[PDB]
């Protein structure tokens, strides 16, 4: 039977690490770090996630605020707010919760966040730097997936990995991190990585997962991954969070639990790890390391 | 037996398209496009490749100059030359031929070329834009592979693709182009893409290629791709160029020719396509579309 990895427990540990780093940063005479989160509209999942972020900030001693704005705001008004926060020396980290409304260009908005305060790692320079294996502010959810694997000791070098999903914010960075050189400035996982997506037929997906030592599902499709797709002993990391009213992942948890060696639950898996790696990025940003 | 795709004939068609585009541009009263190539040292293959590029430029109506510097040049002197070319309004395209001497930081050099003149697409902002599926100057060798596939009419949406190699200028952009969304600003091939590399066990490479509709070898290893690794009728695209006294690719050409449906030869395959796609990028740069 699979070990169930508690992302909640791993995230709490990481937050303890961040709290200590923050406290020693303040005791050294530095300003306490401050995180600003911009929330647009009323997507209730976005509100839940942002509340979890500001909770975690308080736990680790980082000052925070959520600035909530109606969906009817214009792009230029979002940009004006972002520009004010870019020039406010008290703000160390700035992020815009996604998705934004259709009349707002997410890419222009992400590129307007000063790259030094870009704790989500979505600015194009941070994307390019990550894709070149240079030091960069890593996006929180992919970095949380990497930390789950690394802190559990699941090996990656020479291993077969399948990622289901290719979104720029989640699946693509996860595939980048896992396949790239362990010896480069920002090390990668040196795994053999298959990228699948909405046009992979299920039979081709299965033919690739059945070879995989790690399967990472970030499609947002309930029961996309089932025990027959998984070779036994493999690690299955469930990035999906799907409203079905209850929350499930992409993985058939009880089925795959019988065959995988390791498995993450939804909720309590990747989700809390996302919030933890954002706290790590914020103290990194306050320290002006990059 | 396998169709042998002539990279020479496809490139000739692409180059004729560029010659028509450039002369319509010049007929409209615009400055003739101009490409500057910087060439460092005496790598015989580099000199050979640069001559192919400026020979192609002249035939399609693009003015060119190659600026040759000894390998003993320093990093500051190369940067000085690059800055002079960035500010010369006659120069539309600027590229530095790689590899550079060991004492030169290639990443610093590539980021010094202004992104609007970066016809190789090696600047971090162009790498980031490409990885976000945004309009960008695509690197010429990856774009050549893409064109070989599309112009032969080999389908990609939903097909399995294996790329052997992960280098930032060749293997990684190929994997990015092929797996990404057809509906995005810069369309992608919508394929299921496996990325293999130097830590992929040779047995594991076979188990993925035997599933592959398209194998793309960009590793620089003679005879890495052999007939037992290919399923009957798949397309095999040879990006490697290996000096073995002769030139060969990564594929066992004679053997794989008996099982593949399509195959590219070395020489005369991807190489002339690299030169051709650079001409496309140069007229794009002259038009300042981006
Ligand atoms: N911390 C977390 O766990 C966390 C954070 C953010 C988002 N998510 C969740 O991850 C899932 C998607 O995240 P995202 O940002 O990538 O969203 P997205 O909608 O942009 O991504 C959807 C991805 O699903 C892929 N896909 C669709 N059908 C597929 C299929 N049948 N097989 C393989 N791939 C398929 C699509 O091609 C696309 O790449 C959702 O449940 C989302 O809520 C989780
Ligand atoms: N126009 C062209 O045809 C053209 C242009 C440029 C480069 N190339 C060729 O591309 C090949 C590689 O170019 P590069 O810049 O990527 O060089 P590189 O050595 O930096 O990259 C080669 C890749 O090979 C991978 N690799 C090594 N062993 C492997 C294995 N056993 N199985 C799978 N992958 C393995 C490495 O991890 C690396 O990512 C060379 O032949 C180069 O000359 C061709
Ligand atoms: N959209 C974005 N825009 C900008 N930057 C980002 O990083 C994101 N992405 C997220 O914020 N992703 C995220 C997903 C889940 C949680 C989370 O806390 N999950 C709990 C359950 C909570 C619940 O479901 O109520 C769990 O999984 O246990 C937190 C963040
Ligand atoms: N290094 C770089 N730095 C900066 N930007 C780049 O794009 C590169 N990469 C190349 O320039 N790659 C390249 C490889 C081969 C040819 C070529 O013309 N090949 C012919 C003849 C081979 C022969 O006879 O020697 C063939 O294969 O048919 C052209 C370009």
Residue numbers in the entry:
A (entry chain A), B (entry chain B): 36 to 279, 287 to 332
Can I see the authors' text?
MTHFD2, a one-carbon metabolism enzyme, is localized in the mitochondria and plays an important role in nucleic acid biosynthesis, amino acid metabolism, and protein synthesis. MTHFD2 forms a homodimer and each monomer consists of the N-lobe and C-lobe connected by two long α helices. The MTHFD2 gene is upregulated in various cancers but very low or undetectable in normal proliferating cells, and therefore a potential target for cancer treatment.
Superimposition of the MTHFD2/15/21 complex structure on the MTHFD2/NAD+/Pi/21 complex structure reveals that upon the binding of 15, MTHFD2 induces dramatic conformational changes, including the shift of the βe-αE loop in monomer A, destabilization of the αE′-βf′ loop, and movement of the αD2′-αD3′ loop in monomer B. The structure of MTHFD2/NAD+/Pi/21 was obtained by cocrystallization of MTHFD2 with NAD+, phosphate (Pi), and 21. 21 binds to the substrate-binding site while NAD+ is located between the N and C-lobes and surrounded by the βe-αE, βf-αF, βg-αG, and βh-βh1 loops, helix D3, and helix I. Of these secondary structures, the βe-αE loop consists of a G200RSKNVG motif, a conserved fingerprint pattern observed in the Rossmann fold of the MTHFD family. As revealed in the MTHFD2/NAD+/Pi/21 structure, NAD+ is hydrogen bonded to Arg201 and Ser202 on the βe-αE loop. In addition, NAD+ also forms hydrophobic interactions with Thr176 and Val205 and hydrogen-bond interactions with Arg233, Ile276, and Thr316. In the absence of 15, the αD2′-αD3′ loop stabilizes the αE′-βf′ loop via an extensive interaction network. Furthermore, in the absence of 15, His219′ in the αE′-βf′ loop binds to phosphate.
